[PDB]
Symmetry: D2
Subunit: 320 residues, 4 copies
């Protein structure tokens, strides 16, 4: 099923408590959503599906090019599919900068608040506010008002703190301001972006622990691993140790999805093309023929991600 806000919070809490993480797979279509969920299920894992601003726009079609429409349409598709699987699937929106809040995250929040007001659950279970391009205080000011709105709609907020230089530098004062402005979850759960290539996360936890009068080994922050494509399956290990509960994946699953399509076109070149006055071969230019292969291949890469992140076999539905 789709993760209810309650099981989503439980997923993240359990991951944090046991030093594992969920892959958060960028999806852009019915096929990629299907590959991602099947991958979670094959790994006996819960998981996260996320739509970027570009993915949402793509999802809405060339005739619309509206992020909200694309995200809503893909979310509604995903709700139907996920109900048929015995793992929990959370829906998320990726990087939304200041100039796109009004045309992406805010209208999506409003849709979920409307649903919650009628006794429903939100359409998405988390949204990312990416304020990295603005000064920290403005970043956290926006974050605070978004966090209140999100919490009230039963939605977790992801944020990104510090400066982008690609890698994300975050100072000890940035970590402190974040705890100060947002608290430690008691005003609504939130996730904090981070990159690697690592002890910065460790320092972030210690800084926050000190601020909160907590033992020096406490991990107040739930971290989100960005930019980890093909990363050292040892950096991943270390990332997990410092409280990463979510690792974003796109590049790796894109290659996995496209790879068999490429192979299909080459081996079936004279079926997918009308060559030398011939009429091609319907069975191989049928989009389902290569897109099933794309799906299965992406699902396999998602299974690998669940194993690398150690969430495989740990779905909260305990379907074993």
């Amino acid at each position: 099923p789709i993760a209810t806000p309650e099981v989503y919070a439980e997923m993240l809490g359990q991951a944090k408590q046991n030093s594992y993480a969920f892959p958060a797979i960028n999806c852009t279509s019915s096929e990629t959503v299907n590959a991602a969920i099947k991958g979670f299920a094959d790994a006996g894992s819960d998981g996260i599906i996320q739509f970027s601003t570009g993915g949402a726009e793509f999802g809405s079609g060339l005739g619309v090019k509206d992020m909200v429409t694309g995200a809503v349409a893909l979310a509604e598709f995903t709700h139907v599919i996920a109900a048929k699987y015995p793992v929990n699937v959370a829906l998320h929106t990726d990087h939304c900068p200041k100039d796109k809040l009004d045309s992406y995250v805010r209208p999506l929040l409003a849709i979920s608040a409307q649903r919650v007001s009628k006794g429903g659950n939100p359409l998405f279970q988390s949204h990312m506010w990416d304020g990295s391009a603005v000064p920290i205080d403005e970043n956290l000011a926006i974050a605070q008002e978004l966090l209140k709105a999100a919490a009230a709609a039963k939605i977790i907020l992801e944020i990104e703190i510090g400066v982008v230089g690609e890698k994300l530098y975050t100072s000890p004062e940035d970590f402190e301001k974040t705890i100060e402005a947002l608290g430690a979850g008691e005003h609504g759960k939130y996730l904090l972006a981070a990159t690697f290539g690592p002890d910065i996360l460790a320092q972030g936890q210690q800084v926050a622990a000190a601020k909160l009068g907590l033992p020096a080994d406490a991990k107040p922050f739930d971290f989100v691993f960005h930019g980890g494509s093909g990363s050292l399956k040892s950096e991943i290990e270390e990332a997990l140790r410092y409280g990463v509960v979510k690792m974003n994946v796109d590049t790796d699953t894109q290659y996995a999805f496209t790879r068999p399509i490429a192979g299909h076109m080459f081996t079936n070149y004279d079926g997918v093309l009308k060559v030398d006055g011939e009429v091609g071969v319907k069975k191989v230019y049928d989009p389902r023929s290569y897109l099933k292969k794309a799906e299965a291949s992406m699902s396999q890469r998602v299974v690998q991600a669940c194993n690398d992140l150690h969430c495989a076999g740990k779905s909260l539905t305990h379907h074993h």
Copy 2:
């Protein structure tokens, strides 16, 4: 928007009255649904989107393979998208034989009846019952009970009468039995499948007209043109003359969709593949890169279909 049952009936009535038809495009995904709707809109046309049993199964993903799930999920996606366009889009299910009624058309009907009972509109606006493999009397017996259920859920029924030998032969008695069992629309609108390669349709109308005590030039039947891929844009003309209001399209739009994907893989062979120890090129193995081209190309072929069928420029929203 999605066609309400009322505007769908109006669409078909207008087409019949003015000797034009709508293409009914097989779709299997978010991308293909997007291409189809954009095509209707670019042609200023209303249109029909249909899911085959195989397309629905594909739509549900390899991890589910459930026709109802796939059709529902794609329908929900399509409802969101279609609301953003100023043309009317009807949703349809294609060929459902006897052995699949219980796992496709019947559960879908029940979903729509539930929606209608709550004062809503049906999820789909038409369903096809393909009884061509059974004797005509059994075919029409099933058709009658399905027609009653469909009409009560504000859904139009498509049926296929006669024997498949590919082409569809339908005798004058088959046409007569059909009018006798089903009436002429007063017990619920229905569509009748037909093939070409043509005067058979003409004879069908005359036979039905005689039965109904109507003038010899009346056209009681609304016909559905099956198997018309790449057909003589002159057979199409003649088809229109005999009351075809819906022409099914799949092969042509499949080739249009796949063609640029093929071209993308070839020209970007060393970007979509990691070659000679290189790491490929993310920008071209990003599925959106070639799938946007696929979408645009399918939309173009759909525009052509609207022009060939003369529904281009005639959307009932009169957005000109």
Copy 3:
């Protein structure tokens, strides 16, 4: 074997006498020479192999780029191969304009004159002088001195008369000047270029016949059909009627040669490329694997040419 000057003259005389023609296949390599000869042999036909200035330069290799070297090297290769076949193969050089006579046709002539002076036969059996870019009188002046040199080395000269506008226009006076300057073969055999798209050849023969005091149906000229790629196998018929004894072929055999190579690369994409850290498949990146297919395919197209030109089955060796 290679055509001796005597059998080459006999070949052309027989073709002219019986209204058939030989294809003259542009070749650029050992593989293309092999495909051409095998094609002649499979059709039980004599034939002509010709090297363009560009083909000769290509034949000499990127490190040399010398037309004479390339033509000589390919000719020597061809002498060895042709001795193993029971058909006669003539060697020819294609289009040589004024500015290239000193670096192509003239040095080649000198090589053959040297061989003849030692009691041998010439290396090539014909050479083309293409003077179409200069005024007719200069064209024929050069032609006359070249014809004397060629005849003395037992070589037939091909020339091109008239203006290029692509198609070749040749006036009745041009035909007359040609007979006047060169005679009708008694001062050395020569071939006259022509194009189609046809009665111009007919007029040329009548004009020459009148000049020579011959019956109105005589055909003094041996014509060479240039620019006939994919031509109407009815234009070919008419061409034959007017004294075409040689039809130049390049485009058609290029496509035939390349076509299976293309197919080989696509179907073996992950063998001819090292993909995803794999090492490729030696058996399919072995140049012989696809080049054998290229050869066989070009030979087939050459067989077709022999049949279209009616020289198939008529080799002067009468190996049946």
Copy 4:
């Protein structure tokens, strides 16, 4: 130029004396011969071109399939080309087992003996007798009679001693029998095959040195490195130390030759194929278009080979 027997012996002596080696490039065509020679020349190096039994058969064309014809035809081509370069090119035949001596090496030897008897030089400068499949004594018996014939035609003999298990094991007694039967060059120079993956060569030299009453560091054998594709450019170093004067290369140059052809077909897919009723693009299905790229790429790999083997910059023509 082509290496005269005298400069070929000088090449090998110099290489041995200075611990370098020549690549011996398998070639199968005019294009591959051109790429190899251009590669030697670009590296300022002498080099060896060799024809395998399969390469020779391929060279003769599908219509002939005769090893002698193919080798002779390619050799004659190569004589013309090599005269235009300021490096020395030796011609060689690769692996000829017992059952093919009568249809490959022996007739080729006879051709060269005929040339030498008329005061000419041999057509080939070395031939390989591969007796590895027969018992050592039979191997060396054949080798002795072949060596006498070769020496008398001014040809160097390559032999292969020991058992194939792929790698070549050669015992100390095998090395001793070889020196005993053949001497150390005073009865005609010969080359001895060897593989790596290395001290076996060292032991071979010591064994031969002992037999000949030579200092323990003498290197009586001229070794030929077989099976060294992509080998450790450190094994190559060690190979050189033990008296390897010739390293056979095929796989590496095959991949280099084919690689750009593959790329050409993919990027020009709709030019090399007639697609969607189009007629293709002559400029890219012209075999010269991709074969020039193949040639240049193979030449580059040959330059690399000359550098790895340290013969680059050491051509005996001292054209600097």
